Design a protein around this ligand. Structure first.
Ligand SMILES: COc1cc(-c2cn(C)c(=O)c3cnccc23)c(OC)cc1CN(C)C
Length: 117
């Protein structure tokens, strides 16, 4: 049993992950694979962490998940240099995700979520 908000967050997450077929952002970045990461990025974020916050009913709004998604992309553009594959992939994923999490779409979900209460 999940709330209408949780299920909306899940379908949004499914579409966001559709824009990352390489699974660069599926799991947390470790210092082992990216040395000094924990010293450079103060608020790490990834898809699996966001999915756990959905599962635990941590998000009170779609905008909070939108904030976490922007943070995950921004983190990769801080740690990685502009020509790297990870920077370019985060740049493109952020732009694609902002179209998915547009105000127009958040609108429609808020009303249907409200109508199920
Ligand atoms: C290339 O393969 C991967 C890359 C990254 C990765 C992501 N981001 C955002 C980074 O900034 C980053 C920076 N340095 C090194 C690696 C990464 C990854 O993160 C956990 C996992 C894989 C393995 N994958 C098959 C699951």
């Amino acid at each position: 049993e999940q709330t209408p908000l949780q299920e909306a967050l899940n379908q949004l997450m499914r579409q966001l992950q559709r824009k990352d077929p390489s699974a660069f952002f599926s799991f947390p970045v470790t210092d082992f694979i990216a040395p000094g990461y924990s010293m450079i990025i103060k608020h790490p974020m990834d898809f699996s962490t966001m999915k756990e916050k959905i599962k635990n009913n941590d998000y009170q709004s779609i905008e909070e998940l939108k904030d976490n998604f922007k943070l995950m992309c921004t983190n990769a553009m801080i740690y990685n240099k502009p020509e790297t594959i990870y920077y370019k992939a985060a740049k493109k994923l952020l732009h694609s995700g902002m179209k998915i999490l547009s105000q127009e779409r958040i609108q429609s979900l808020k009303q249907s979520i409200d109508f199920m209460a």
